[PDB]
Amino acid sequence: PFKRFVEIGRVALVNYGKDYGRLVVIVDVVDQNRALVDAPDMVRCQMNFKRLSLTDIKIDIKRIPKKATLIKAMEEADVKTKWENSSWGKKLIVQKKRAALNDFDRFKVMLAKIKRGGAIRQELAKLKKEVA
């Protein structure tokens, strides 16, 4: 049993190149290596499976569908929202946000996390001693 296939509709992260991070809909297959990928911000183009990491979101669309219907199906399957709330899709967003922290923000994060460490230390001690 396989849990993720290349088929018309499925959205994939683009996991390599100048264009890391973009989500693209596989609207057609060129051959066993290359695919047609389309996006709301980017014009349909060929792009290689080795540069595509498939995701778990699929959308019910035509073959090489018109741009309007591709958009309407993308919000019909709420791909950007579902990606963002996905743990995988949240991984990339959180790494960009951690990339965006400056020094004062990083110091506030350090202070916020030291108290959390002390808190979980206190709590773990109490609960371990509670469990007799």
């Binding site: 290349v6 047609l36 090489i64």
Partner: protein
């Protein structure tokens, strides 16, 4: 983006000669990497077919053809003449590609791989967008179906950019198709 080949069309003619001061005009559709290489290949063909050499010839124009719809996949056919190690041969090759230019580059690489023929050896007789329901070749014709579906049997794991690349990674990678 950048295409290793381009399809030009080149028009030339013999020099005017005070006998028949309007020579006949020859048009050809060439593939080459740039303008000067297209021109140099053009005089090749007119010298070996129309008995016209560049010194007694004249270049009228070189123009570069581009593809109508780069955003649509097209089944291409190339009838090509090549030189093996022991003679010449005629082949038909079908490709799928968004541009004839990319299909031709695909064909040069495929010929250089399947038959060890270099680009100086290949002559493209004819190129034609052979639409589906007429493709003769299994590898092309097997991709002609809606509801196509298959996994990635082969996918590289690699940092998205070079910056994330480390020699030591404590955890075995998780691969699953």
């Amino acid at each position: 983006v950048a295409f290793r080949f381009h399809q030009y069309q080149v028009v030339g003619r013999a020099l005017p000669t005070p006998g028949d001061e309007q020579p006949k005009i020859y048009r050809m559709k060439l593939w080459a990497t740039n303008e000067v290489r297209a021109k140099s290949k053009f005089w090749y063909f007119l010298r070996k077919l129309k008995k016209v050499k560049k010194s007694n010839g004249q270049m009228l124009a070189i123009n570069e053809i581009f593809e109508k719809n780069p955003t649509t996949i097209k089944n291409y056919g190339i009838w090509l003449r090549y030189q093996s190690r022991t003679g010449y041969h005629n082949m038909y090759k079908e490709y799928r590609d968004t541009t004839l230019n990319g299909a031709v580059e695909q064909m040069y690489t495929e010929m250089a791989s399947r038959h060890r023929v270099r680009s100086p050896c290949i002559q493209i007789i004819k190129t034609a967008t052979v639409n589906f329901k007429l493709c003769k070749r299994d590898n092309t014709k097997q991709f002609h179906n809606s509801k196509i579906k298959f996994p990635l049997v082969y996918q590289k794991v690699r940092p998205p950019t070079r910056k994330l690349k480390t020699t030591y990674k404590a955890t075995r990678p998780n691969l699953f198709m």
